[PDB]
């Protein structure tokens, strides 16, 4: 407080930046952060803000959404470290999103792809950029929950080119293959020839789908899967 009494440019800033070593009062550390932002050098501090995580990211994030920097990207890190993704990407749609989401999923984490995309669909975004980011190289991904949030939104019609390019080389993922099966259910035809030359999809899955729809197709479904008792039932 005697520091901040004056201008208190950065002296006791460096002082804490030394003392931070086993310094567990996160409030003074956040004030220290504010200082690092006075003349922005959080660059070399945001890194330890990744390490130092004994604080309350709420008023922190508020300070951030007041701290204008236009290229900060620890806010995303603390965000998904505490899962403030909803309101974060919310204000992000409010102002702008071009690559922040993208640079996050590429360098930081392609894990939360599907959930954030579902958020985008919730905020009723522009599908094109979703296509584009899908084109952007990723790491890992789980399709099941993605198409689940889809079936909530009912707007899968857009990863299908991704599946096209992907199976274009022939990834034998029963996941993506039954996803194809779903989009073909949507396509409203008879891929029994496809159903047979594709052993990759899950017949049990497509059958438990078409329970209502198409027993005349659950036939060949269970016949690929030899699900005779299910065929009976």
């Amino acid at each position: 407080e005697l520091f901040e009494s004056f201008k208190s440019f950065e002296g006791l800033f460096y002082f804490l930046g030394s003392i931070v070593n086993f310094s567990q009062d996160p409030d003074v550390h956040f004030k220290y952060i504010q200082a690092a932002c006075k003349t922005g050098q959080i660059k070399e501090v945001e890194r330890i803000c990744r390490e130092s995580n004994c604080y309350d990211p709420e008023r922190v994030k508020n300070f951030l959404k007041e701290a204008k920097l236009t290229d900060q990207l620890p806010l995303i890190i603390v965000c998904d470290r505490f899962d403030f993704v909803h309101d974060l990407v919310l204000y992000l749609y409010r102002n702008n999103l071009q690559k922040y989401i993208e640079i996050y999923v590429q360098k930081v984490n392609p894990s939360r792809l599907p959930v954030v995309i579902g958020g985008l669909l919730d905020v009723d975004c522009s599908e094109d950029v979703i296509k584009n980011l899908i084109l952007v190289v990723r790491g890992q991904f789980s399709t099941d929950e993605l198409v689940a949030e889809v079936e909530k939104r009912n707007r899968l019609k857009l990863l299908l080119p991704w599946l096209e390019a992907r199976i274009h080389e022939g990834c034998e993922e029963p996941a993506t293959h039954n996803a194809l099966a779903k989009i073909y259910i949507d396509s409203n035809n008879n891929p029994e020839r496809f159903l047979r030359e594709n052993p990759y999809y899950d017949s049990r899955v497509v059958g438990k789908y078409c329970e209502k729809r198409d027993p005349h197709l659950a036939c060949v479904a269970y016949e690929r899967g030899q699900c005779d008792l299910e065929l009976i039932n």
Partner: protein, 116 residues
């Protein structure tokens, strides 16, 4: 704060001073909608959570508040983009009760995808 501001707009609903509330709101609110924003229609003090959820784009919730409010045309006008199974059953049952039937079927189109 948020407390000050949230309960502030809450009391503003208590005093129905919307025509200046929502206008002040455009500033750095530092508050949290959808909590007092809830309380608005919760306390039936409508027409504001209308505006709140508007400036937060809370489709359906806002449309439901239109319903309880008696607003029914712009209700479907928001449902056309909201398009949640909720939105659809809302507009269906309400508009039937609203005794509008033409637009009722016009919106009932969008549910028949679900035979349930």
């Amino acid at each position: 704060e948020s407390y000050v501001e949230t309960e502030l707009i809450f009391a503003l609903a208590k005093t129905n001073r919307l025509a200046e509330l929502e206008e002040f709101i455009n500033g750095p609110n530092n508050a949290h909608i959808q909590q007092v924003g809830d309380r608005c229609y919760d306390e039936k003090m409508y027409d504001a959570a209308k505006l709140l959820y508007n400036n937060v784009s809370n489709f359906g919730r806002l449309a439901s508040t239109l319903v309880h409010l008696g607003e029914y045309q712009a209700a479907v006008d928001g449902a056309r983009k909201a398009n949640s199974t909720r939105t659809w059953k809302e507009v269906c049952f309400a508009c039937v009760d609203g005794k509008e039937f033409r637009l009722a079927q016009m919106c009932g189109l969008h549910i028949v995808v679900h035979a349930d």
